[PDB]
């Protein structure tokens, strides 16, 4: 709101906080990104290195839906089970009845291996897995099922 602004406190003072010498002007250094290579060069190299120039190969007509692959770590793998159902699987870490986790229905593309799942066998249906995420799922007795 206007009543809390310094404009109200600058009433009565001549320059409104802009100085008598500097004498607040229209666009003293140019407009926008002007002089990024000439008179604003130091600010660019200090705070935005990499701004000028080109980087690698172009991609005509990029569809981000091609590259959709949300990653899920192993420490969050057991969150795909509802919590009331989750405890009776943590107890009785048994094969012949193992939770089937469809990571795709929860919206994940690749299972990654941040690790330390419990020692309960788990059936993981994943589009992709990392090598280490596969090692820790098999070490717990489970298996990774490849889907599409």
């Amino acid at each position: 709101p206007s009543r809390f602004t310094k404009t109200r406190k600058h009433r009565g003072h001549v320059s409104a906080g802009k100085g008598r010498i500097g004498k607040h002007r229209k666009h003293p250094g140019g407009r926008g990104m002007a002089g990024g290579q000439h008179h604003h060069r130091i600010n660019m190299d200090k705070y935005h290195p990499g701004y000028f120039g080109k980087v690698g190969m172009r991609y005509f007509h990029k569809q981000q839906a091609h590259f959709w692959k949300p990653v899920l770590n192993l420490d969050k793998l057991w969150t795909l089970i509802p919590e009331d159902k989750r405890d009776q699987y943590l107890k009785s870490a048994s094969k012949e009845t193992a939770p089937v986790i469809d990571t795709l229905a929860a919206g994940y593309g690749k299972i990654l291996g941040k690790g330390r799942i419990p020692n309960v066998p788990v059936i993981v249906k994943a589009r992709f897995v990392s090598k280490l995420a596969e090692e820790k799922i098999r070490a717990a007795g489970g298996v990774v099922e490849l889907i599409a």
């Binding site: 190299d45 705070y47 290195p49 990499g50 701004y51 120039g53 943590l90 330390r116």
Partner: protein
Amino acid sequence: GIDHTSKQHKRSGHRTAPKSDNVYLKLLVKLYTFLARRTDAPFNKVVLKALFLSKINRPPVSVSRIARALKQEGAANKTVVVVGTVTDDARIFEFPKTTVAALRFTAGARAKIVKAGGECITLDQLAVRAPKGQNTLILRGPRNSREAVRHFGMGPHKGKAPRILSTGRKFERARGRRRSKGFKV
């Protein structure tokens, strides 16, 4: 005239009160002001100062962080004190039965502590049962893990994050960031 050695009329630079207008936090400050003054326990003075802190100065404390601190030798039965919010953490699967005193609990954090057999209490209940902070263990969350801390201290060779909106190729991965394009950092 006086040859002044230090700046005159200088405020201490520390909060003497919370900026918050929460009436119940003011009652907690009112209770722990009395305890810090009428007791010699350094615990009460630390808690009173922590009640003044801003939101970024009291990051959330995970229950996993609480559980790791209870794995310390001789700390398995202490009252964990968090002047701030205790959040849940699903990455841990074995929580111990302990008592946590905190300013705020999330719904998941309250459920996890109670389910493990423990108890969630407020800071006024902590004061009644531990007036001098006996057998307490103050826990603080990670303060430099904020996303704004990444960009603090930007400059050449500093290895800090640039203040950027859109990331990827074509956004500050060129001249100034690699030897093939002018110079690097």
